Amino acid sequence: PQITLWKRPLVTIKIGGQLKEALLDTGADDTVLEEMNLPGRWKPKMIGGIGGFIKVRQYDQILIEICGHKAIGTVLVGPTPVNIIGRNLLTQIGCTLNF
Amino acid sequence: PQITLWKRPLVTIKIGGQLKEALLDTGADDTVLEEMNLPGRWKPKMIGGIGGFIKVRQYDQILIEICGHKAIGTVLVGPTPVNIIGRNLLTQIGCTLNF
Ligand SMILES: COC(=O)N[C@@H](C)C(=O)N[C@@H](Cc1ccccc1)[C@@H](O)C[C@H](Cc1ccccc1)NC(=O)O[C@H]1CO[C@H]2OCC[C@H]21
Questions:
Q1: Domain residue extents for chain A
Q2: For labelling alongside B72, which of A3, A20, A64, B89 has CA 20 to 30 A away?
Q3: What does each C-alpha distance from A87 to A29, A49, B82, B86 come to in angstroms?
Q4: Does 3.30.160.620 match the CATH number of domain B1-99?
Q5: B12 inside 8 A of chain A by CB
Q6: What residues does the Peptidase A2 domain cover (chains A, B) (predicted)?
């Protein structure tokens, strides 16, 4: 679809079989979700943003469905204030900015 | 134009008579620029991202040219690691996400 930016670009995602709301964020390199129980191995990692760094769990090769488009890639899980879909998965679903 | 998301979506902006590089960021409500001395009145504000909050100076009705498209709105100035163009100005240049 085509999404304007008058409101936050929130979409429903499906991950680990659960539905969540997440923000489509072109300013994020990486995808970061709030604390949740995901199956599989994970590695400790740190990620930095506007206010500093947080500790996250890095899950590799995770299936995530974003408005019906499938992606398989890295998901970081940790104490982010908002669920963020970053460029690592926006590219897989063919997302571009247009103006 | 059309901007893909393989790399950070950095563009040249013109503000306060100066040229800068900034990130087009659908995940930001507001526009936040690195420390710069802008003339006029301002209001204190705090803005939050991953990792916490930073203190910024809020300037109103600032003109910014983004790849030749003009926008006028609120600009926050403070110790951000990167210049961020947020939805308050992306809507004015007619920017959409498409997939
Ligand atoms: C209403 O609150 C706001 O609008 N807040 C605005 C200011 C804000 O912070 N928005 C972020 C999403 C967001 C986070 C928390 C709450 C609401 C929204 C992103 O849109 C922009 C940042 C920009 C940035 C790039 C490089 C280095 C530092 C900062 N990107 C980011 O934090 O990305 C992380 C994940 O991926 C990695 O890549 C870059 C850094 C890492």
A1: 1-99
A2: A3
A3: 5, 15, 16, 16
A4: no
A5: no
A6: 20-89
